[PDB]
Amino acid sequence: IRVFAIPPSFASIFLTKSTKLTCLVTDLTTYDSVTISWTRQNGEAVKTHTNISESHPNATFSAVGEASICEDDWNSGERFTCTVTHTDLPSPLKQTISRPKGVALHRPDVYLLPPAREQLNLRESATITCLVTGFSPADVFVQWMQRGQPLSPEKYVTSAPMPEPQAPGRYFAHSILTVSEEEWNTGETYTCVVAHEALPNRVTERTVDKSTGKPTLYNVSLVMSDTAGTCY
């Protein structure tokens, strides 16, 4: 029996404006003897709603507990613990989740790399990478789009942040999206959207296509008329 506690994310705060706590419990044999509750440091009771999921193929059951807390409760760093009690566990399981302090704010940087030249020759698929680096803390939210249409959560993948060996305190992550070769050869556009607290407007976006980003040639035309006009 293992318990996973997920602290609230910045995206959930921005796009929903309601701080929530979740301590998922798995590897449960009986769902009629489970209880999920949250207790404060001083012992004040917190209202928690417990939900029961379906039956997993491995003869296990998962319980989901969603509870409403004030943004201050989490942002203050107040240490919270989720209480899980079961008849098969001689001692209740306790998990400690909190937000660390002494963290500065650093604006992240975003760059897109176009698909490799020798990948398009096979005419199978193309891969685009969105590299975001130089940020703290380590909670980011990257979403891909195609000419204003949000893309499905399944066509792109993202990686957990990892420390940067060069400069400590600044992290990085990247998102990889695949596309059809003909679709990319047509000339469609793609956008990378990242949400973080350090940004002034809190969201930034960048756009790449076939004509921009490692192109083959540059075609320019210039016209300069009325060169002998009145200036005064």
Next chain:
Amino acid sequence: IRVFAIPPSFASIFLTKSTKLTCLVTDLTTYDSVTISWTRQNGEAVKTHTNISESHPNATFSAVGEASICEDDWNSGERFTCTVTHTDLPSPLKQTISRPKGVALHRPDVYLLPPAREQLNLRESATITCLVTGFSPADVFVQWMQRGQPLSPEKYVTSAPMPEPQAPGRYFAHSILTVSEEEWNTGETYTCVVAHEALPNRVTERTVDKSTGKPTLYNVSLVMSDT
């Protein structure tokens, strides 16, 4: 008393160039009463270089067993077992390990991507990417090189394999290296080497330079109409 006999991965095999087995046993009251000796299929004794680690703060001790065997015998499907005898243990504990056979094998592909132009315009740093994808199982060992000599592992970072949502049964991984823009602008060369068990020669290399991606045509026309 917990006994763990993990087999070495592909990275250890390709880095130390020798097959070394481990039968480390932790949480031992007295390591003076420990004995590590592997066995082949025939059950012969194994020359084991037993090692003693430091003293854990929780009054526990561990013994490390190192044995060198010819690699040609593991892939043939021979099970190796280490026997550990302790005074507190009434009977020896045996862990039998072997190589899982029947794993699907596919050829990884290597793609190297040059640093972004916008990042170089800031004249601060440059980054390179070594994308390896379409491979199974999850055993990949990737290094970097510069003019034929290797660099410390503190200047590049690699990621663990992650399943590919598009094609079931395929994995992918990435490596990120940092380069000073000025060095990059000098004209040096960087190499990415990928070592996998499915490749015919186990080794593949890719190279990227500063001149990667330079355009071919610069069609420009100018008109001056003094109207």
Next chain:
Amino acid sequence: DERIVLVDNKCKCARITSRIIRSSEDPNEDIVERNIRIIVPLNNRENISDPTSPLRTRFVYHLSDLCKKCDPTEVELDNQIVTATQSNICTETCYTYDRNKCYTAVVPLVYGGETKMVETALTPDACYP
């Protein structure tokens, strides 16, 4: 110090300076010089406020509509003060962005089904909110 700036456009990045060189010694044989400096962007698109617009590969620079004055000036006539129109010639396209200006956009963000449109920053840094 020896040059006078006439126009300092930012959208077309056009800058014109004029200078008189005292060539030789005859006052009637001094040449008048006009310098034009233009910086063209190769990555910006047709509409700088819409990332989906196609790329731009045609640039037109009319000098009659660049060195033009369009601000009423005050003139003293010894009995009153009046406002005077400098030129009678007074939708222009902005090729490049302006540092003193902020460029923003609207983008749909989906998360758990709900869609929250949020103001973005097309420019890298520019100004802060």
